[PDB]
Amino acid sequence: KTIWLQGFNSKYVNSRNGQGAMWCDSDTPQAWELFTVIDAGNGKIALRGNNGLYVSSENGEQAMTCNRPAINGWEVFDWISNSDGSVSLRGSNGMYVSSENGEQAITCNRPAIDGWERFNWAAAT
């Protein structure tokens, strides 16, 4: 139930310990790159980061974060299994989580899946 997410730039999604926004900038998956997948009901998931806080879409109004203390909503996502075995994540605003190729903090404001919105994943163990 613990995973990492590897973005388009081959880097790993980084919680940044809840200090600022999340980035897809880590060269290897260590503690801040591991997320506990939480079954949130209704076929949705949430993600709890290294700091015990929850990943938020921020409804696409600003870059994604991992510092919400509880799940509401903007903290639940549809897990989309892609044909190649990658995953995409659709926030509750209907937009997709984007690595932004590591050039800016991760966002959830894209209406369609492109390369930056596809992640390789694996159970951390």
Side-chain angles (χ1 to χ4, degrees), residues 95-109:
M95 308 294 110
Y96 292 99
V97 172
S98 176
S99 70
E100 302 286 355
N101 201 32
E103 310 168 339
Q104 64 187 272
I106 295 169
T107 59
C108 189
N109 54 38

Side-chain angles (χ1 to χ4, degrees), residues 3-6 10-13 26-34 122 124:
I3 64 156
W4 48 251
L5 296 162
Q6 187 187 28
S10 305
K11 311 279 194 44
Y12 296 83
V13 172
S26 290
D27 301 293
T28 74
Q30 294 186 78
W32 297 6
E33 293 67 42
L34 301 185

Side-chain angles (χ1 to χ4, degrees), residues 50-71 73-104:
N50 73 288
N51 56 359
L53 307 178
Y54 300 90
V55 170
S56 182
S57 70
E58 300 288 357
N59 214 34
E61 295 162 14
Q62 59 176 294
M64 293 185 58
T65 54
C66 192
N67 44 40
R68 289 267 138 86
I71 300 166
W74 301 343
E75 292 69 48
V76 293
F77 299 86
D78 303 309
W79 180 285
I80 303 312
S81 319
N82 298 314
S83 318
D84 59 349
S86 66
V87 61
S88 295
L89 296 169
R90 194 173 32 188
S92 61
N93 60 354
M95 308 294 110
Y96 292 99
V97 172
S98 176
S99 70
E100 302 286 355
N101 201 32
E103 310 168 339
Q104 64 187 272

Side-chain angles (χ1 to χ4, degrees), residues 1 35-41 43-49 54 71 75-77:
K1 284 262 201 163
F35 296 88
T36 300
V37 181
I38 298 305
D39 179 1
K44 307 258 182 215
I45 62 100
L47 297 165
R48 180 166 58 232
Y54 300 90
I71 300 166
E75 292 69 48
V76 293
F77 299 86

